[PDB]
Amino acid sequence: TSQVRQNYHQDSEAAINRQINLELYASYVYLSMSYYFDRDDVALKNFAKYFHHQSHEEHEHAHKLMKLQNQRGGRIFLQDIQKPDEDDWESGLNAMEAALHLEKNVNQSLLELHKLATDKNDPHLADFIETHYLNEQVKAIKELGDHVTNLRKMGAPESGLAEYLFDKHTLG
């Protein structure tokens, strides 16, 4: 047992390791999306930039969790970062919809993690999740929702003009 370990349940330690992997997975999904929009037959550079930014945001999310694991005296056990479910993301709208779904999945995991922290009477871990993750999730979900709505109302994905104009006026 670590010299720093105090009030840190083995279940919480395991849950943190799982969340680390999920954040790294989310980062990979966004990296995949970024380079899809970099394709010569897609060519939406601000979509590419947007998802690249999201990829690095997820990387920071993974960082804070790995730091937390060591702070609490838990031990980091990394797992494979699974390849994303798609190679071809179809369109700007589809990518935004897939991102929205991803963020709701990540949020669900974090809410489960918060419940576990509460159940194990770990207020430090509970507050860590609240302070650094829960509102970040809500903000991300709202933003992606907003983006999906605009694209749909503009005529995407059928209208290539819509996706082009959104790339220029919202993501640029």
Round to whole Å and give the CA distance between 94 and 99. Answer: 8
Contact between 85 and Ca ion per CB under 5 A:
no
DSSP 83: P
- Tell me if 61 contacts Cu ion by CB under 5 A: yes
Of the candidates 115, 87, 84, which has an alpha carbon nearest to the alpha carbon of residue 101?
84
Residue 79 identity: Q
CB closer to Cu ion, 10 vs 84: 84
> Has 136 been labeled as part of a binding site?
no
The least CB distance from residue 128 to a second copy, in Å, is 7
Between residue 99 and residue 138, which ones bind Ca ion under the rule CB under 5 A?
Answer: 127, 130
Q: Please list every residue from 79 through 138 that binds a second copy, using CB under 8 A.
A: 79-84, 87, 100, 104, 107-108, 111, 114-115, 118, 121, 123-124, 126-131, 134-135, 137-138
Of 127 and 146, nearer to Ca ion (C-beta) is: 127
Buried b (16+ CB within 10 A) or exposed e, 151-166: beebebbeeeebbbbb
Rounded distance, CA 55 to CA 34, Å? 8
Binder of residue 61, out of a second copy, Cu ion, Ca ion, none (CB less than 5 to 8 A by kind): Cu ion
Q: CA-based Rg of the chain, rounded to a whole angstrom?
A: 18
Kindly tell me which of 11 and 101 has the beta carbon lying closer to a second copy: 101
By the rule CB under 5 A, 87 interacts with Ca ion? no
13 carries a ligand binding annotation: no
- Answer yes or no whether residue 57 interacts with a second copy by CB under 8 A: no
Selection from 68, 72, 67, 84 nearest residue 22 by Cα = 84
Residue 130 assigned as binding residue: no
Distance CA 157, CA 161 (A): 9
Annotation-wise, does 103 bind a ligand?
yes
Q: Which residues are annotated as a binding site for Fe cation?
A: 23, 58, 61, 103, 137
Q: Which residues are annotated as a binding site?
A: 23, 58, 61, 103, 137
